[PDB]
Amino acid sequence: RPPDAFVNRIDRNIPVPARLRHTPVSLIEAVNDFHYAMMNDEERNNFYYEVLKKHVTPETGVLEIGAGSGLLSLMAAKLGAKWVVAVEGSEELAKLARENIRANNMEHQVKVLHMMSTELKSKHLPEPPDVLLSEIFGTMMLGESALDYVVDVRNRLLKPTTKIIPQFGTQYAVPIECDALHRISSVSGWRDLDLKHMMTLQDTVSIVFAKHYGIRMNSVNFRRLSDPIELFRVDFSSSNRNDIPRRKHFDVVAKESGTAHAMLFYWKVTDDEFVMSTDPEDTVNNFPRDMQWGQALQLLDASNGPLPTPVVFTEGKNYNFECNFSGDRVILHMQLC
Amino acid sequence: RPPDAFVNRIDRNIPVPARLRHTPVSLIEAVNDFHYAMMNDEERNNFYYEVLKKHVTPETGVLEIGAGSGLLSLMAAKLGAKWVVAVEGSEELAKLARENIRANNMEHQVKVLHMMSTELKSKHLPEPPDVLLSEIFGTMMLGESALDYVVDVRNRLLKPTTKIIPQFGTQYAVPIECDALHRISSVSGWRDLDLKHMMTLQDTVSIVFAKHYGIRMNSVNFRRLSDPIELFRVDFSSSNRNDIPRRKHFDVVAKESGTAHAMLFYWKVTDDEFVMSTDPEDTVNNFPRDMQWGQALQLLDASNGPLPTPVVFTEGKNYNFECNFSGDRVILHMQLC
Ligand SMILES: Nc1ncnc2c1ncn2[C@@H]1O[C@H](CSCC[C@H](N)C(=O)O)[C@@H](O)[C@H]1O
Ligand SMILES: Nc1ncnc2c1ncn2[C@@H]1O[C@H](CSCC[C@H](N)C(=O)O)[C@@H](O)[C@H]1O
């Protein structure tokens, strides 16, 4: 009986079926919160299948960072890989991956190791892999430290001819007007009652996932006020942290007049002709993707006064933004200068 | 300098304006996550204004449970209340309420006490109030223990003629088919790869807010498969916990054929002719309400087998559900029998 069995925190008058009772709550939460949505992103699954298909042969050894359900590792095995090893940091997700492997009679082909990729050593593998596979992207592309984890494996366990899937990733930002977002992130007053003091607290610093607001970008009216800003691009086979500056400046030309309530962040990952994008334009008919990755938002303050100042764009004018990054390049912030 | 100053957990390369720097993170989170949306629910504000208007005179003393921003207490003062006392459990929200009161020059009329209502005593008030006011409703109506807190004050601090605002609340449930929800809460497979084992973990126990899924009910296709089920009704001036059974059974007649993926929960609060509803039908044009309260969902399992069994409705047939409550009546669960 696990100390964190699901049944423990449920009220004793509420029924819990046997299949859930003694399962750790953390696993039920991970699968219900994330994994069903991931597995229903058919375009994501197809992207990985098509890219793997270009590379996997009976002679190809495949290493995956982050087994999860085991789906992508199962794909590599389906495609006839020589061997597949997947690392998974979560003990319970590792067990679950093994169950899915068992269900598809592939225990002889796919091995799941419970460990973080940082702890993986050459002795844990039959030989250096021909393919390195991962899907550890966040709502922000590098949100789950994809670059750092791939770099660590790339430095230590691969060989010169190893194909890293996926190869490329680009993080974008675009200033947007969005009245729905504005109405849940600001206030002025109610009739003759002044509530402007509430604005002193407006969080124009944090990156917040659209999901956290309760919003799906594809389901509200918003306007992109400029062409997309490429914040940075990485090649997972060659890039390092220092390929991304700690501070960058961008000249943003307004294509539309309006209020830039927020910066909208989305990304695009590619490998040869195949593309995995979180641009709302590309996810109108991909509800599971909008639920699993969605997009991120940072509210914009034009200045540093006692109250936030709206960022107002006039068509045809230039707007300079300073982008600051954390050391690991995971956290960023856009400030009008 | 507070130990939990907002600036503390922000990366040192990311700018933070003075207005945010030394403010406790908990306050910034509460206001950004909840209070802007609340304050932009114009129908909620109008409901309270109109009900207060029926009762508040220069002779009326008003007690509010839960000051928050201070908006509703400010309304009572605007309407010319004799005196207004609002309790607020959060020290920082109490301070914020006081700031809003100051901004509207009403410090002589509205007093905010930092305490939970359970700690409020007769000596803290000028006299027993003529009006008790609260907006402590959750996504589930009793989710923030509204009944318990009102009952405690009602037992101790009021007088026979005290008007309790709002008077009535009714919690509803309705079985729904919703393909979008289904696609982020289930899986069967991917091509020839069997993923049915993942279904052993489907959480058909928890009440989960639509917001948590990332979903807004008014923005996805869903079908109500029966008339609404009234789970319980309360009169805040008279009801107690034992007016709600610990277990209830409901006969639900299918009006439509389809799969009942989930029970959808919403509520309606009334006082005389005025209504505050979280039924999606009533919130199509109230985005802030859908963001602040929204609706709740419980996934349905027809049985207690090793895998979940879909609940399938055929038009014209009867379906029996057992509703179990926690002791405080805050948590409930619907099970097909
Ligand atoms: N550096 C690392 N080492 C091992 N596991 C990791 C990791 N970073 C993330 N993970 C795990 O990787 C998974 C990412 S999501 C699962 C992806 C899965 N292969 C699929 O495509 O369907 C999570 O289960 C997480 O626990
Ligand atoms: N029993 C209780 N005693 C005191 N404060 C409470 C309470 N239950 C909830 N609260 C506080 O009540 C507030 C509810 S939301 C704020 C409502 C505000 N009066 C408005 O209508 O705009 C929160 O700030 C919460 O901290």
Nearest to A79 by CA among B192, B267, B27, B252: B192
Distance CA A266, CA A252 (A): 17
Rounded CA gap, A241 and A218, in Å? Answer: 32
| Chain B closest-CA separation from residue A292 CA (Å) | 9
Sorted by sequence, the CB contacts under 8 Å of residue A45 that are 6+ apart come out as A39, A71, A75, B190
The answer to whether residues A143 and A280 belong to one domain is: no
Phi and psi based region of residue B204 (left: phi greater than 0; alpha: psi -120 to 50; beta: remaining):
alpha
Q: At which of A101, A134, A166 does a domain end? A: A166
Phi, psi of A72, deg, nearest 5:
-70, -35
Same domain, B177 and B28: no
Q: Whose CA is nearest to atom 25 of ligand 2?
A: B66
What distance in Å separates the CA atoms of residue A256 and residue A234, rounded to the nearest whole number? 30
What is chain B's length?
A: 337
- Is A39 in the same domain as A78? yes
Nearest to B263 by CA among B336, B161, B194: B336
Question: Which residue, A185, A211, A178, A198, is CA-closest to A283?
Answer: A211
In whole angstroms, give the CA distance from residue B265 to residue B140.
7
Residues in CB range of B227: below 8 A, 6 or more apart = B174, B253, B255
Q: Is the CB of B149 under 6 A from ligand 2?
A: yes
Is A241 found in the same domain as A130? no
Structure tokens given for A5: 């069995």
Helix A91-103 and helix A71-78, axial crossing angle in degrees, nearest 10: 40
Judge whether B282 lies within some domain. yes
Q: Are strands A332-336 and A318-325 parallel, antiparallel or unpaired?
A: antiparallel
Number of domains in chain A: 2
CA of A88: how far to CAs of A97, A134, B189, B218, in Å? Answer: 9, 11, 21, 38
C-alpha A52/C-alpha A89 separation (Å) is 23
Nearest to A234, CA basis, from A294, A174, A290, A150: A150
In a domain, B1, yes or no: no
Q: What is the token pair recorded at A164? A: 């890293």
User: Both A105 and A254 in a single domain?
Assistant: no
Reported in sequence order, the residue ranges of chain B that DSSP labels E, i.e. its strands, are 61-65, 83-88, 110-114, 131-134, 163-165, 168-177, 189-190, 193-194, 208-209, 223-224, 229-235, 247-253, 258-259, 262-271, 274-277, 296-299, 312-313, 318-325, 332-336
Which residue has the least CA distance to atom 24 on ligand 1?
A: A68
3-state secondary structure of B288: helix
Does the CB atom of residue A149 touch ligand 1 within 6 A?
yes
Query: What spatial distance separates the first Cα and last Cα of chain A, rounded to whole Å?
Result: 57
Which residue range forms the structural domain that includes residue B106?
22-166
Residue B335: what residue type? Q
**Domain end call among A143, A166, A189:** A166
Ligand 2 centroid distance, CA of B21 (Å): 25
> Hey, which bits of A144-244 come out as E strands?
163-165, 168-177, 189-190, 193-194, 208-209, 223-224, 229-235
* Nearest alpha carbon to residue A135 among A238, A57, A239, A37: A37
| Burial class (CB within 10 angstroms; exposed 0-12, middle 13-18, buried 19+) of B155 | exposed
Report the atom number in ligand 1 closest to the C-alpha of A87: 4
Same-domain status, B31 and B117: yes
Asked if the Cβ–Cβ distance from B183 to A287 is below 8 Å, we say yes
Q: Please count the other Cβ atoms lying within 10 Å of the Cβ belonging to residue B136.
A: 18
**Cα torsion angle, A22, A27, A32, A38, sign:** negative
Whole-angstrom CA distances from A259 to A29, A55, A307, A332, B41 are 38, 47, 16, 21, 22
Q: 10 Å Cβ neighbour count for A113?
A: 17
Using the mean position of ligand 1's atoms as its centre, give its distance from the Cα of residue B214 in Å. Answer: 21
> Is residue B109 lining ligand 2, measured as CB closer than 6 Å?
no
Q: Is residue A2 part of a domain?
A: no
Q: Do B201 and A17 touch (CB under 8 A)?
A: no
- Inter-chain contact B291–A214, Cβ cutoff 8 Å? yes
Chain B residues inside the 8 Å CB shell of A72: none
Q: Which helix (H) or strand (E) holds A320?
A: strand A318-325
The answer to whether B70 and B104 have CB atoms below 8 angstroms apart is no
Q: Which of A18, A100, A288 sits opposite B184 (nearest CB)?
A: A288
| Cβ(A292) – ligand 1 distance below 6 Å | no
Q: Are residues B194 and B73 in the same domain?
A: no
Q: Are residues A174 and A162 in the same domain?
A: no
B209 within a domain of the structure (yes/no): yes
Q: Give A154-161 contacts, CB < 8 A, sequence gap 24+.
A: A154/A236, A154/A237, A156/A121, A156/A122, A157/A63, A157/A120, A157/A121, A157/A122, A157/A125, A157/A128, A157/A129, A158/A128, A158/A129, A158/A132, A159/A128, A159/A129, A159/A130, A161/A130
Residue written as token pair 């985005």: B287
3-state class of A60 per DSSP? coil
Residues B98 and B174 in one domain: no
Instruction: Based on the fold, state whether residues A175 and A246 are members of the same structural domain.
Output: yes
- Domain-located, residue A3: no
CB of A90 closer than 6 A to ligand 1? Answer: yes
From ligand 1's centre to the CA of A144, what distance in Å?
A: 9
Helix residue ranges per DSSP H, B197-331: 210-213, 287-292
CATH number at residue B267: 2.70.160.11
Cβ within 8 Å of residue B300, ≥6 positions away: B175, B204, B260, B261, B262, B263, B310, B311, B334, B336
Cβ within 8 Å, pair A187-B335: no
Secondary structure (3-state) at A73? helix
**Ligand 1 centroid distance, CA of B77 (Å):** 55
Q: How far is B54 from chain A (nearest CA, A)?
A: 18
- A220: closest chain B residue by CA: B219
CB B136 within 8 A of CB B86: no
**Bridge partners of residue B80, in order along the sequence:** none
Select from B166, B186, B206 the last residue of a domain: B166
SS3 (DSSP) at A31: helix
Please check whether residue A72 is in contact with residue A135, taking contact to mean a CB–CB distance below 8 angstroms.
yes
User: Which residues of B are identified as catalytic?
Assistant: 135, 144
Across the interface, whether the CB atoms of A203 and B32 are under 8 A apart is answered yes
Q: Are residues B227 and B239 in the same domain?
A: yes
Q: What angle do CA B11, B16, B21 make, to 5 degrees?
A: 100
- How many residues are there in chain A? 337
User: Is residue A14 classed exposed, middle or buried when 0-12, 13-18 and 19+ CB atoms within 10 A define those classes?
Assistant: middle
Supply angle C-alpha B280, B285, B290, rounded to 5: 50
The span from the CA of A86 to the CA of A39, in Å, is 17
Please check whether residue B3 lies inside any domain of the structure.
Answer: no
Q: Which amino acid does the sequence have at B12?
A: R
Residues whose CB falls within 8 Å of the CB of residue A306, separated by 6 or more in sequence, listed in order = A200, B18, B19
Measured between beta carbons, the chain B residues lying within 8 angstroms of A17 are 204-205, 301, 304-305
- Residue B10 domain flag: no
CB contact under 8 A, B205 and A10: yes
Give residue A116 CA to ligand 1 midpoint distance, Å: 9
Element (H, E) at B73: helix B71-78
Write the CB contacts of A10 (distance below 8 Å, at least 6 apart in sequence): A16, B205
Per the CB < 8 A criterion, the answer to whether A334 and A263 are in contact is yes
Q: Which helix (H) or strand (E) holds A61?
A: strand A61-65
B296 exposure class (CB count in 10 Å sphere: 0-12, 13-18, 19+):
buried
Please answer yes or no on whether A201 and B75 come within 8 Å at the CB atom.
no
Q: Which residue of B has its CA nearest to A218?
A: B219
Task: Give Cβ neighbours of residue A317 (< 8 Å, ≥ 6 apart).
Answer: A253, A254
How does DSSP classify residue A32? I
Does residue B298 sit in the same domain as residue B191?
yes
A256 is catalytic: no
Closest residue in A to B211 (Cα) is: A214
Evaluate whether residue A9 is within a structural domain.
Answer: no
Q: Which of B38, B65, B100, B111 has most ligand 2 atoms within 8 Å of its beta carbon, as the pocket-test mutant?
A: B65
Nearest CA to ligand 1 atom 19: A67
The CATH number of whichever domain residue A74 belongs to comes to: 3.40.50.150
In total, the C-beta contacts within 8 angstroms joining chain A to chain B are 223
